[model samples]
Target chain A: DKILIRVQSAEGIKRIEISPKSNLKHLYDSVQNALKVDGFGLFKERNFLTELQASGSQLVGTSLRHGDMVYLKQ
Target chain B: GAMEPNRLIVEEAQNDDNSVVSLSQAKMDELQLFRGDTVILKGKRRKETVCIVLSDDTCPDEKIRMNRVVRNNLCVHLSDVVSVQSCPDVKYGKRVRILPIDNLFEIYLKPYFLEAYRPIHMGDNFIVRAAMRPIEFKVVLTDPEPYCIVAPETVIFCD
Candidate 1:
């Protein structure tokens, strides 16, 4: 089985295919790659998602199913 | 202040500029708001946007009009009443990152007249005029942006 999540940014809304195994950082990293717009691209910095980047996975994954909206701030 | 119970109506389709939300003059006084006054509109869980005040005679005091830009970002429909309040002055973005080429005049800090131009590719930072102080937003745009991101990052404060 597979899960699809919709993420919207300036690029308009788009769907991201993912697995239950993937975590928050994976989706967070996906947007950065997709958009390639970052304030800290030049320097290393840490924030909410970044903090979650190293800490763990499956945090929001468990309850947040497909079609659920998630707000990811950079 | 707590969220005021304000019925939300989608601003007419002709209302292209979404930076400001329309309220009835009667409601404006009810909310104790003045034109150009900043307000925080909380819609959907954990999603909120800063908006400017614009009073319309036609609008009913029981209803507040929100442009499509805001309507889309908040994922709100005509059925729901969005919570709002007249925010007090001086919102210093405790942090920042940070347009449309021409369509972005709405968020411009200075009073501006609309004009035409080409849209720029995404950058690390973008700024727009706000109720008073200019607010900065983090850059994240669709390739060949379809205008500006109404979902752009902003400082959400409650006073």
Candidate 2:
């Protein structure tokens, strides 16, 4: 099963398809591709990472079923 | 520390001698003022002039009351206003001053949010030395509201 992730920035939006079995790190990687930030995936800052995780809590640690859409804002 | 006297040069003056009562309400309505309008408020003693409009009112039978922002001084019931000359094109360049957010928050925001941020004292005052060329003043930062957005990408965020 694959999940479609839509990422948005101050600029615009893009879509990425990833596997349901992928971990939270995979979502971060997809965001990097959509936003095109060079060192984007590494968000070690506690406050920022916590905000992202809290926003993605519904899908975190859960297997993505087909047609599931995840949205991330950077 | 001793307070310094604020000086203002009067360019013009007018006398309203008509016994025809200019109602306080009429005067109030006639005087349309903005935050940074350079005005010469004439009265007895000395003509007080400064930046920023603190407050203003016109009541029947009493004089016009005007309070200023720089000094926060109240000029009460000042009768015999010789004139209210509008000093257009008065130069007030852009100023970037480090304001103590704690002091500001204490006066405006809730107490809890005041404690969250680190307490910083008076710091640098960055005054952008660019002329306001043909001054058309407007109200700003009234009640300490976040009116300006400081985004890294956009330049038209001030308006």
**Every model's DockQ, to 2 decimals?**
0.01, 0.01
| lDDT per residue (tens digit) for residues B12-101 in model 2 | 112221101122344333454332233443333443332222222333322333322111111223232433433332221222123322
Candidate 1: which stretches are off by over 4 Å?
A1-74, B1-14, B89-159
RMSD of each: 15.3, 20.8
Clashing pairs in 2: none
Model 2: docking quality category: incorrect
Report the number of the highest-lDDT candidate. 1
Runs of candidate 2 with Cα error greater than 4 angstroms are A41-49, A53-74, B1-153, B157-159
